[PDB]
Design a protein around this ligand. Structure first.
Ligand code: NA
Length: 176
């Protein structure tokens, strides 16, 4: 394998949502914007919109379920986010069960809980440092101001235009 990647930014360039409220952040979020160093715009087959459901457990970790529409079926990816060093920061639960994955970091950058959210991800897989940013939406659509702000923040982490994508809304699986 030979492969080139845009460097993961320093954590100082990734803000943290102040006084993060885990209870208010639960529920379904739509992925209305997706950016990252391993993410690429594919004009021939545009990425379809997928959803991620956060649900607080008793021990204050999240059962994180992502649901996407792939190959005419609904695929479900169930993961666990364990609370990290500061509120709004999380590490991946049961990391040993994922082969190659030596590191995983989640950081809630900004959110108003009832409309939108921005979450930063960083992961070292096979000694390759990947990072991504997701524009979460409570509905499938969001304003141009929020979308241009997501593009602005994505660029501030060294990501060009073609590494920023906006998944097209769909009705399959991500509703209900
Ligand atoms: Na990632």
């Amino acid at each position: 394998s030979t492969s080139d990647l845009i460097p993961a930014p320093p954590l100082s360039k990734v803000p943290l949502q102040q006084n993060f409220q885990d209870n208010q952040f639960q529920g379904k979020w739509y992925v209305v914007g997706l950016a990252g160093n391993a993410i690429l715009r594919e004009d021939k087959d545009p990425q379809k919109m997928y959803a991620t459901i956060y649900e607080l457990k008793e021990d204050k970790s999240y059962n994180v379920t992502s649901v996407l529409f792939r190959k005419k079926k609904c695929d479900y990816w169930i993961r666990t986010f364990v609370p990290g060093s500061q509120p709004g920061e999380f590490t991946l639960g049961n990391i040993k069960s994922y082969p190659g994955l030596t590191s995983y970091l989640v950081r809630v950058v900004s959110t108003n809980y009832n409309q939108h959210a921005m979450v930063f991800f960083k992961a070292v897989s096979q000694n390759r440092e990947y990072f991504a940013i997701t524009l979460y939406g409570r509905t499938k659509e969001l304003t141009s101001e929020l979308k241009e702000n997501f593009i602005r923040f994505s660029k501030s982490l060294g990501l060009p235009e073609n590494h920023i994508v906006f998944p097209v809304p769909i009705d399959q699986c991500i509703d209900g």
